[PDB]
Amino acid sequence: NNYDGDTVTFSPTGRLFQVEYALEAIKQGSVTVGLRSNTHAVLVALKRNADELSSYQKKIIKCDEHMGLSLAGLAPDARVLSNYLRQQCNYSSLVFNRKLAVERAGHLLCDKAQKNTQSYGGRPYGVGLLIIGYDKSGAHLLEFQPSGNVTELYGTAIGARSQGAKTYLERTLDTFIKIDGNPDELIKAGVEAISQSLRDESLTVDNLSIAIVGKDTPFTIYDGEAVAKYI
Amino acid sequence: QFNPYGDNGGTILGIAGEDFAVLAGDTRNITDYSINSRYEPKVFDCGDNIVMSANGFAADGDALVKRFKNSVKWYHFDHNDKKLSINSAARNIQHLLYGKRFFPYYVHTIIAGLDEDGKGAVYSFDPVGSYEREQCRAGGAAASLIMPFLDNQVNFKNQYEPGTNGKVKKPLKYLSVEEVIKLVRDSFTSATERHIQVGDGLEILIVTKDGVRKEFYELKRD
Amino acid sequence: DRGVSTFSPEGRLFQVEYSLEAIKLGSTAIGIATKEGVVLGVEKRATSPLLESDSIEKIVEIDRHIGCAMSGLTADARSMIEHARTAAVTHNLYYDEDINVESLTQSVCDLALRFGELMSRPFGVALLIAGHDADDGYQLFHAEPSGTFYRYNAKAIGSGSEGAQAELLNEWHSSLTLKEAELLVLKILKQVMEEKLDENNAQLSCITKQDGFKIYDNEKTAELIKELKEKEAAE
Amino acid sequence: GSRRYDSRTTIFSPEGRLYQVEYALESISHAGTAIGIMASDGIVLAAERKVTSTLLEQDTSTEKLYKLNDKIAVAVAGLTADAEILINTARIHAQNYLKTYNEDIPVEILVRRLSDIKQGYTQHGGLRPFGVSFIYAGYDDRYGYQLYTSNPSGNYTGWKAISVGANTSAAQTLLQMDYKDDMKVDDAIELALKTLSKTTDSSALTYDRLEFATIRKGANDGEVYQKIFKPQEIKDILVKTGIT
Amino acid sequence: TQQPIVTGTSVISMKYDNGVIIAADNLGSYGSLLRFNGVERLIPVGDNTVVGISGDISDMQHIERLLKDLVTENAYDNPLADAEEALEPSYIFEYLATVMYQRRSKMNPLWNAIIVAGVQSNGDQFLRYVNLLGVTYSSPTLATGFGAHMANPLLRKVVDRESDIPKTTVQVAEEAIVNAMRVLYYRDARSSRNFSLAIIDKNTGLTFKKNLQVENMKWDFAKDIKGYGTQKI
Amino acid sequence: SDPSSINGGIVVAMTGKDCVAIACDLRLGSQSLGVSNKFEKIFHYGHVFLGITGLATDVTTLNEMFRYKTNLYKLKEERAIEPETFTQLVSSSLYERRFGPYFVGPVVAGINSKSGKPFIAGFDLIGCIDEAKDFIVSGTASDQLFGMCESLYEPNLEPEDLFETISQALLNAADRDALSGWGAVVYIIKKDEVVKRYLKMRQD
Amino acid sequence: TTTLAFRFQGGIIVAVDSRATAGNWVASQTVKKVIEINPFLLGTMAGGTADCQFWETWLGSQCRLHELREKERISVAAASKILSNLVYQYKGAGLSMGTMICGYTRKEGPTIYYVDSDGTRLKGDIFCVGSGQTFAYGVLDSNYKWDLSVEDALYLGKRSILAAAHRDAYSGGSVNLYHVTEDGWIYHGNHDVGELFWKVKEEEGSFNNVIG
Amino acid sequence: GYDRALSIFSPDGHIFQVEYALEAVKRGTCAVGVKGKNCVVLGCERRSTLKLQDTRITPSKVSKIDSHVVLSFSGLNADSRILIEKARVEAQSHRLTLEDPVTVEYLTRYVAGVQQRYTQSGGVRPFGVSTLIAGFDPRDDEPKLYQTEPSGIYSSWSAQTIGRNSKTVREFLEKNYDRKEPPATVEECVKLTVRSLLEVVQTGAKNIEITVVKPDSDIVALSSEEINQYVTQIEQEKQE
Amino acid sequence: MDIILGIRVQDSVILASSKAVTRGISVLKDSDDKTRQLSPHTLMSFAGEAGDTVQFAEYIQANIQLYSIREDYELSPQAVSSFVRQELAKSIRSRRPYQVNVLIGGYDKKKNKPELYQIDYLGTKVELPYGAHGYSGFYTFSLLDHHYRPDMTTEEGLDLLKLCVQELEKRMPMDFKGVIVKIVDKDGIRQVDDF
């Protein structure tokens, strides 16, 4: 109200409204789902078009051979943050000959986003990210919020109507975690999860975006006729 | 006074075929009159069907290869996983080298692969980034021993057709991958005999449309 | 007052949303992508008859294989064009090749959100970037001051955009010829323009693989306008 | 953050006026009147000190008339402290020019430089403008005797006769009435003092409430002399012209 | 640009079937003066890596502090710091190699020759060299300074190529290393009798041996040597 | 190569009874080549006189610099600078270039307008003040000038006698120096009159 | 290196050799010592290979940006000055360049500028540059006329490089010919000196000193 | 440094600081530009509220940027000096690097670019100035006349006016200027320029300035008497 | 470059400058004009290190032309020479100094007098009746010292200049390929096309 003019101002109840408004931009964004087993981690994203002449906005970005994310909210902010992850993954490899741990990647994103919430002049990031990866401790899935909060999960969803997919994953938890050594079934579970968030529209060939990383599987993105198999 | 440069010896050789390319190099690494390693790989697969070797001062050689491999990675990120063509890689390497014009990478760089028409390609660089596409190029310690032999046996220089006595040249017939590998092995065997910094092992990377294959051969260890 | 980089309660940047309103006041620009080329057309909209209309430059070359049309605060576009041209030429210098149309567009869009308290405000102009490359063929992009860019089969920006876009919705198909696209841009420009369309208050351009980017002569466009009038009178 | 307290000194009003420049001009309209009159054989500078005291040491006092170099002088109207900042800059500029070209700085070039400095404070930096208006009296071998004025906007203009500070409207009308082109310095001296005597807010015009200066080629042969009048000399010229 | 002041001589090492061995004497020389007699030049990092350093001792102590800080930093926000995300020999080496080459590129080198010996997570032997120029190389045997000229020839008789590594036991390897240290004591004028030896095995882990001495020395034949040619008495 | 002896030249100053004298040669050269016979090395700022020997570009630069500074001084102080005060200003200005100095040998001469006391001073290239009672010398023939002054000089000379002494000191010193001569000027300075005299001398 | 360029009735002839050396070692006989800045502009290459390659390729980028911005062909004067001003910034650092910038515009006609790494920029009719420049000058100065046919002008340039290739040890390999008209340059082939020498000797009657 | 964003968008998509800069131009004295077949004429209004002015030394309204290009303006006088100085520096820089004087279009594009930059840079306000830039390209006999404004947009004009009551004189020019046949001589072009100012000026005395620019760096400013003869002839034809 | 001469006569200043440009072993050009017009009545000739000479001359030219446009006024030769001297005096303590020597010949329209200024790369300025840079003075000053009278005509100045050039062509080892001669007077600057 009087305390939402900038990010440097607490409200009387201890809230940061600019951060909360940035969180609101994610809710307007298109739905994206993340889930993993012990061998693989999968991203599924519903891409959004402007109209029938336009292309469908890409949702998934590769960060390294073993890591990548999906976005919901301001796409340019995802480009900035993914670029930062690319550099950090790259610094780890060049200097230490070491693939960056997914947990450490989450810590770096948290700290970068935090600086934008405590200083004058700047603004919070207006995007939410779902990071998947396979490192020395197996498969991982992270959820990033531009408040700075990063959380490691078995499965989750962000964006508009993401609550439907999140409940489904909460039911299916015991099933999909056991899908080891079977990429197609893990993606099926993700495609079925994101379907719980659809209304009026359904998953078409240029609508659906899928990404997977695993034990002997580099981070690869599937679009177009490559996802027709799962429709 | 501190000398930031050193000489790790070694010798490399690139030959472009009709639908293939080879980049070879000995595996010996030295300083002065000592052997550091009998097997230290010098020719690297950099992705996108491109092989590279930066021969001379090994620290600069490793740094350059490392920065080029990195440039391939970022080329994919920035341009929608587009394949970096050999001519584009060559121009990129010129800028990496010329960036340190006034404190140069003390190396002789050679890359090999296939051009956009599928034909064999070899590019050669000096330490400060001047480059040129070539059919044949040796680099490093025994380059002066090897190049004349390749002028004669690959390009048929000073060879004419019997009976004509200098009137008709020997026609420039194309060489198979098996033929090129024979010339590479004989080049390094001969270089090993007469050059003290050449020996131990020979590693050849062969590039075709199918990908990058490796071959290793023993060289004399004295 | 309030920060320049402030979020609204709906999760939108105030300044970006306000710059979009300035673009709605701009003159109309239309782009249509075909398999034979991409056509770019603009409304010149001279404020007075004494203004020499051929000095109005709202269609611009970025490289031989990339053209660009603008709508909104057109003075803001000049530094964007300069950056685009520099990016296109610089990439050719570094890589001995043409730059991808998407990569060029992405480079332009990276400037967009570089504002705060860098430049003091967002750009008040939208761009239609059209071009060709070997990998993805003929392409048309819509670059906004939000930093977002969409690829389009056909797109209209400016004051007559929503009326034009609805018309482009019906008319575009994947088998359009270059000639059919030219007439289609002229037809829709004529529909949404205040003044009567002629060769002096409207401008056409195209990008083909063979000839590259070309701005059309007033004599060439005048013939296409006459061809349009006759085919509309034909039924 | 800090934005909250920013007055924004360099913005246009809806009418296209610079707020701070307009308000600075309002400040200057309460300063003591300064008058410049250009004649064929010299220039006169006359200025009124603001409501003084009997305990003020006049002979060592200077609030109106300042020397920029041997050829150029200024009359000040506004904040004296602001004026001294600019005056010292102008003195340096004159010396920079003299060092560079080995010639005395032409009057206009000095005036343009100071006016450009004033202009800058109205367009960038977020600082308040200088609350000062100058009358420049000077001589060079190109244009001869010259009068200029500058104000907080950084705009400057040339004059035959001009006033700044308080009651300029009344003063300018009186100057416009009695000024003629073939006028001489001694006549201009009389006009300046008569104009101040009529426009003054004080009861009577006396020597202790005035600063006076002349720039004359009344220097032995082809050269120019600046004369900052002493208190006794102002008293004498007041008697000569018949004001006291 | 500087000059080394207090220096350490050879570091020697070799691979064997189940791991690596590394050794270095305990001397800190000050030119020809054998100044400091209790200097440890093998520095363990965790339980899987030993970094052996020769050359300038002030720069060695600086590197020692970098490695100590590296362990601290790796533990930060790392629940698997003592397991899957522990420091590997390859990570430690690449870090040092980066620092060495950066410092030489600023014309202000760390005046050292370094050998990183260790065993990786998958049991693989790690042995690699780096020096003040940023030059790096790997071999079944590695040695610095005088060791390169005298130790390598002896160690290469045990492991001459890669295929000799599985045929070489820890007893044979240690025997060869200890003999090489004796030879260096005979022939290097900047060496000492006292040395440290470290074994990193994939089964038995890190064994760090301090206060070892060169023994079984041959000197008796010296009594028969008289004059420099013609002298008989 | 030596910057202080590329162009050549000399300056000498002397005190007398209620007067001072400062003199200089007129030569400017490029080593062996004589370039100008009208290069005066003495300047004045009000009643304070400054002679400068050494590298000619720095002679010109410093003159322009001290004109600059003494003009600002006068505008602010509302009086002409005095010899004692100017001497400190020269010293301060030279020392600010301690590690990139002007290659010059300045000499100050004048009479204090309030006390009437004659004043002379010399400097090295970085500011050190030599405040002699009798005389100051500078330039490529400074050794010669020291010899002339030390024998010819006597205290309390009248203005017209001092003229003869300083003139003969300059002339005979210059004639034993390859890089000095080609004319000469002598300033005789009294409290409110200064006479300038050009001397006839050999032109080789 | 021997490079030359000269103005005549038919435009400009550019001729260069092909040899590159590291000491006495012949590093290459196939060097492209002419750079195609655009269809209208050529640059010659002498001194350091890299310096010349890099900065004349860069020059083509600046020329392209000029004509994108100004909707007009860049003048030879303006193009040459961009390069000379650039190398002047680097003066002292150790760049090694001797180049001819050659073009043909409406306003200028055929124009050649000699540009140099010490900052020298000279307009002229005939320039020769490189270790073998003196040898080539001899043939040019005695045979040059304005009223030369494109055919004869091309041969003179070829013959002048050959003269230098024969005598100068750091020149040789092959000859690259270019002809610059107002609609652009035109390549006139690679000519091996090993074959060209015996051909010219036989046909021309020259080099009687050499046995064949 | 002072970094405050003064020029920003409003909810309706307007940048008020740029629009208020145009209001300063509206207040400024009237300036007019007319191009003939072989010339361009720049006319300027002088407000007669200021007499006792010294016209020898007072800053003239038309400024030479180079020997072949001139610049006039309407709006803040102090602001115009900054643009004129930058333009003059750029003109000499162009001659130095390109070895050719600026085209009129190039010089206009530069001045317009400076004006635009001041509309999205922190800590600065826009220029309260619109300019008329006129001249002839080197070795060209085609007349050139361009206009710029605070926003940074620019364009070419057959004839144009800026400043106070410019709406009235533009009305006059739009009905009196024929494109198929522009003022064929200097006389006709000056006459049409003086006529256009007489719609707005008041007295035709010292209130009208005229500057004629012809090809090949031929620039001259008309005197009071020369202009007065045009003023006399115009009204004598009007009495009919 | 090599030889630059200057002579100030009754009503004009005459500058003579060699035409040769030599890069080491070859004479690349024999028609080089080593001069720049700074203003309609001011000419500057120059000689020194390659590149620096032209770069400095054109930089000075640009600055004087800028002044002329700003003030609508031509600076006096004295003022221009002082500006040039200061630039060189600034340059001599720079990271890389301008290695350039100049003569400035101008006609002062106010005083109706020709003026010749000699300035070296250190910033050493002198006004002279005649001057030179490098070894040129070494030959010519004796002839000029003899024959020069301050009231010579332009034609007499050219004849005395021919005698100077003839002496140079006799005794100088280097072939400087003749001189380009230019005259600066009340009507401006013109080139003598036959010398």
Ligand SMILES: *[B]([O])([O])[C]([C][C]([C])[C])[N]C(=O)[C]([C]C1=[C][C]=[C][C]=[C]1)[N]C(=O)C1=[C]N=[C][C]=N1
């Ligand atoms: B030419 O002789 O100048 C030649 C042309 C070069 C620009 C392609 N230069 C060289 O051959 C130089 C050496 C040299 C010889 C004679 C005069 C000047 C210079 N060689 C190189 O620059 C070189 C050598 N080896 C590899 C790469 N570059």
Ligand SMILES: [Mg+2]
């Ligand atoms: Mg060998």
Ligand SMILES: [Mg+2]
């Ligand atoms: Mg003599």
Ligand SMILES: [Mg+2]
């Ligand atoms: Mg040869």
